[PDB]
Symmetry: D2
Subunit: 337 residues, 4 copies
């Protein structure tokens, strides 16, 4: 009768989800990754190029990963249907492999003994949630497979909600200037499904499609047809920034925009949306747990109804924190039985 | 009876202007830079981290830089009033130091012997020009000091002109995702006039100003109050991209946008504005001489009146070619 | 009765081998890569983040890649035994996939119709060659599967040959400061066989084992037991540098070392070993076709018998040129029938 | 009756020295930097691209920088002779500007009121110290201006001492693969005193000098003529690694090398020299306070008398901690 968590895919998100669970006191009972044995998991969790050394103890024994004296079972399965989730008492599962994105693909975790699945990416069909925006729409009795959307959606949606509710978004287009990720290549190589994404990640500014802005209209249905966008991948290893250009229905002097964002940050979006007026740059958000940090000085108003709003996000770390927040939220709701 | 060019500030722009002049047959008679001696100028011109080795001969002798057998006088002065422009026959001067941006600061070149000055950046008061957009407003009678605007302005203005003339820009905002430059720092250091610009250039996405925010509506006055924008400096050493989000007056389905850009690129803006449908990334424009290369596949439309348009530019190389094109244009008009 | 070439694995080396063949007038009859279709091959060959746009025409039609009007057959096979080399008249095959490194693995090309194979990497057992060092040891009648060693070996061996023959190498240890490659990761990810190599390539200086110095003693047997070394992978996308610290038998004033290197560069190692006294840095060798460029000003002599010698190499481009040179050499020798 | 510290040059080293002082309870009474005002110092100290946000409070008021409630006077002088060190009670001064390296240049601090000066770089003439190697040679009677050598010297000297004392270094040569620094350039620009250092720092592997080449045999005189080396600057923003290739007198099988380093790290060089057998890379040492971290698995031996030894260092952070350790050592010795 406590939340327990299983992680499938011990990657950037998977490992940082474990870090967040340790920080928040969420019990992780098992990790599955066929490419990382237990001894190697210790190394990959202990040392991080982006987020530093884990501040605590990491060891292995008895085929287990032991973090701050918490024993975590380690499985080595290539397919969700192979994973023995029943053995660790039917945990809530984070699907962070990147390759099981549909209800059908993720449902094999349920039949292998998972109580619920949270897909750590947009899904073509599983219901999507962004904490601070639409988590109340989760239904414990009808949804065992959900999605926590993307990092970009988690940055954009809270800001879009604040702005739309105060001023009215008539239409908006967004760009994210985004750090490279594990799907990209060190040098020019094959990416048949998205050719630009094969090009050397460290050498290039790379345009890339993203459903993340429209995704904000799955989580904020009033914005259907009113928001879309795209990405540029650039040579930084973490932290990204949303640039939202929108036309507003009611006049929105920039002072009124700042006040609305601050009010949201201090109140209902505390911990999700933050507000700064400092002269920040991307590294200043390494390790930041917010979904969206509004950059007051970087935005521009052409006029009272046409503005460019800028918001930062640690795409690895903020998102991993939201995965945990969504799990905890789901569990508190699922207690409705 | 012929165009001759002097360069003040033998930097990224100054050296690439000399390369462009060599490519386009324009005679450079002198280069001034107090921080680079002739023998050192050979090395800095011969080897380039971004644009490769100079394909030709580079030597020094008799206090001169010699490129492909052309002798270039080398001066070593810290202030424009010190430079002996009269000794090399009153050249047209490129002001590419970054620190003499006003008519007042640049006029010292004229009184030191320069025939004309082209400031290689936006100016608070000198008239600004973008080839393909407003060069015809140059008035030989009354403009001895001019500006070639900025690299971003040279990318944005040709595209904005095409879109505005075809569909009508009601309002627009732009971003440039821009390579780092010489004003930035390798590691966090002082930049009291722009604090974010001091932060390590290779480590950060850095919000910043763009010269295009102010310059674009000087060169296209009809857009005054309808367009501005900002930059993010990112960890690439050259090539940048404009992302222009605009609301349009006339219906602008994306097929019509593509046909409008193509027409401009094949016609009046040939050599200035190009058009691609290839799956391009920033390195694909290293050494491209165009001002603006419209990326058809990267753009997105929300609807027929609200669109995001993407256009690339080699911020060092395209702009340097435009400096040379402006000089040749001025010289031809000065014969009136 | 002309050299014809088949490429297996159209990667950094595979594509740059095709560029070199075009430059040198070597006929490439076919390319095989299961991850790159013909239309996508056009794109990957045309545009290069490191070496610029291909200067010529690239098109596809009739299931073929057409470069400067030369038609090249394109195959899409995952295993060497699947490739129809007989269909294109028994070419000499470049094995540049990175995954068929042994005589046994590469021999399937022979049974599929390849006349010879050149493995574009060190082999555990195929005989290895470095142009300018030991190519004369190739035997047309006994070797159908050979190796062109590695980029580092191709840089080190020519210099080591010059120095050993003039002064005598008593012992030497080398480091290569080397650009990242396709085997590395954009962000921290799994590399179970070599853990450091999983760490983000763009963020880190990464120590990495290399058999490349000892490899110089397979190609220069007199140096057995006398040379080994290691690598640091660093955040550049191409071009690397050898730093060889050696104790010499005969006194070797640095002026005598420079003269020996120059004599080799102007004479028997022309096109293989070059010599500069300019104030060069890594980008200055992008596109350089030499195996080894000796940096006169960067080296140090502690004394007449103990020195550190520095030599540059474009690891992608120089090596790709040597693959072609070795093919042409093999073919001229194989004419012995 | 207590150590007080003044910092001249509030740069990478100056700010990280203030961080180290805050961590180690050392009182900083003043900071001087003509290029950073108090309000700007708050920002530059609070936010760090490499080492993260300062974990504490940072404010300005009354012309002062206030860190965790400690008031620090802020001066704005361009020359040491201008700095009012007497106003803050004759502090021990860190000279971390990079431009006052000689006894003669640094002595102006003494005549302006400094009790002592620690130059944060090798000096042509001031006596140089490496903690764990030769600090005992400091003579309070006769050394008011000293140097803490360089970061590479602080990595190399402790390891060289251990190896030489155990096995005897016959001869050695070293390389440091070193992160870029503030002296380097974002894009190819002028560096007339060291041409390769002008080339774009983020694009290139750059051969360069290391302060350790000359400094190591000043701090370990027994190695004079037996050790020198060079650097390659590469595209990382912090952390560097020494690669020491030496011929040894006594048999040195690699197991014995490991036991010798371990013994030093656990004993007399605790906090200075560390020892790891983990599969480490450069980022793993961000924020490490040790001078030298021996990488057991990365090294290689050709034979029992010829070996290559690898040791890491956070060039910014480890060195800044050593500056503070040297100041505290000097202060304790000055009580004699
Ligand atoms: N990195 C980001 O910024 C980010 C942010 C939000 C969401 N996401 C999403 O999170 C998911 C993972 O992203 P990542 O960045 O962590 O990628 P990653 O490549 O770092 O991690 C994927 C992990 O999954 C493991 N794996 C692969 N196949 C597996 C399988 N069949 N079974 C079990 N494990 C398998 C890999 O070995 C690896 O450790 C993706 O859907 C991604 O879109 C990423
Ligand atoms: N780099 C770009 O992308 C780009 C593009 C368009 C325009 N610009 C503008 O061009 C100008 C030069 O920029 P850059 O990127 O070439 O900078 P840079 O730092 O590379 O070049 C400036 C050069 O001026 C020399 N210099 C400095 N002070 C001088 C003086 N007082 N007198 C003579 N020479 C002096 C320097 O030694 C250096 O060689 C700036 O105004 C910049 O805004 C830059
Ligand atoms: N890049 C260098 O600096 C360098 C230099 C010298 C030698 N090498 C060696 O050359 C070889 C290739 O290196 P690379 O850098 O070009 O790697 P790469 O990853 O860029 O290229 C490998 C190519 O092989 C293809 N491939 C993968 N599996 C295949 C298969 N089963 N059949 C056919 N094709 C397949 C991939 O799709 C890819 O295009 C490796 O052995 C490498 O060690 C690399
Ligand atoms: N960065 C490293 O890894 C490192 C390590 C060890 C030692 N050092 C040495 O430390 C010194 C500082 O290096 P850094 O990397 O901190 O450089 P830096 O450029 O970051 O810092 C120098 C600071 O001095 C200030 N300054 C410049 N001129 C001044 C003057 N005349 N008076 C007062 N302040 C002035 C600058 O505004 C800047 O804040 C150099 O001697 C360097 O060799 C650097």
């Amino acid at each position: 009768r406590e939340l327990t968590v299983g992680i499938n895919g011990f990657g950037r998100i998977g490992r940082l989800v474990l870090r967040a669970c340790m920080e928040k006191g969420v019990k992780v009972v098992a990790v599955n990754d066929p490419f990382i044995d237990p001894e190697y998991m210790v190394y990959m969790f202990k040392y991080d190029s982006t987020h530093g050394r884990y501040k605590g103890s990491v060891e292995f024994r008895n085929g287990q990963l032991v973090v701050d004296n918490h024993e975590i079972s380690v499985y080595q399965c290539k397919e969700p249907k192979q994973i023995p989730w029943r053995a660790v008492g039917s945990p809530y599962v984070v699907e962070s492999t990147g390759v099981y994105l549909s209800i059908q693909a993720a449902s094999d975790h349920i039949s292998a003994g998972a109580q619920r699945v949270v897909i750590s990416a947009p899904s073509p069909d599983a219901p999507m949630f962004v904490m601070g925006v639409n988590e109340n729409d989760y239904n414990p009795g009808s949804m065992n497979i959900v999605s926590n959307a993307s990092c970009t959606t988690n940055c954009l949606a809270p800001l879009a909600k604040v702005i739309h509710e105060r001023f009215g978004i008539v239409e908006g287009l967004m760009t994210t200037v985004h750090s490279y990720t594990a799907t990209q290549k060190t040098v020019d190589g094959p990416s048949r499904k998205a050719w630009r994404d094969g090009r050397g990640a460290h050498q290039n500014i790379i345009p890339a499609s993203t459903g993340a802005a429209k995704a904000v209209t799955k989580v904020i249905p009033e914005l259907k047809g009113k928001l879309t966008g795209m990405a540029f991948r650039v040579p930084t290893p973490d932290v990204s920034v949303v640039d939202l250009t929108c036309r507003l229905a009611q006049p929105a002097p920039y002072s009124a925009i700042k006040e609305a964002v601050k009010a949201a940050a201090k109140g209902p979006m505390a911990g999700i949306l933050a507000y700064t007026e400092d002269e920040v740059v991307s590294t200043d958000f390494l390790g930041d747990t917010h979904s969206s940090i509004f950059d007051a000085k970087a935005g521009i108003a052409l006029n009272d109804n046409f503005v460019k709003l800028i918001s930062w996000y640690d795409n690895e770390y903020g998102y991993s924190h939201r995965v945990v927040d969504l799990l905890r939220y789901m569990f508190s709701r699922d207690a409705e039985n």
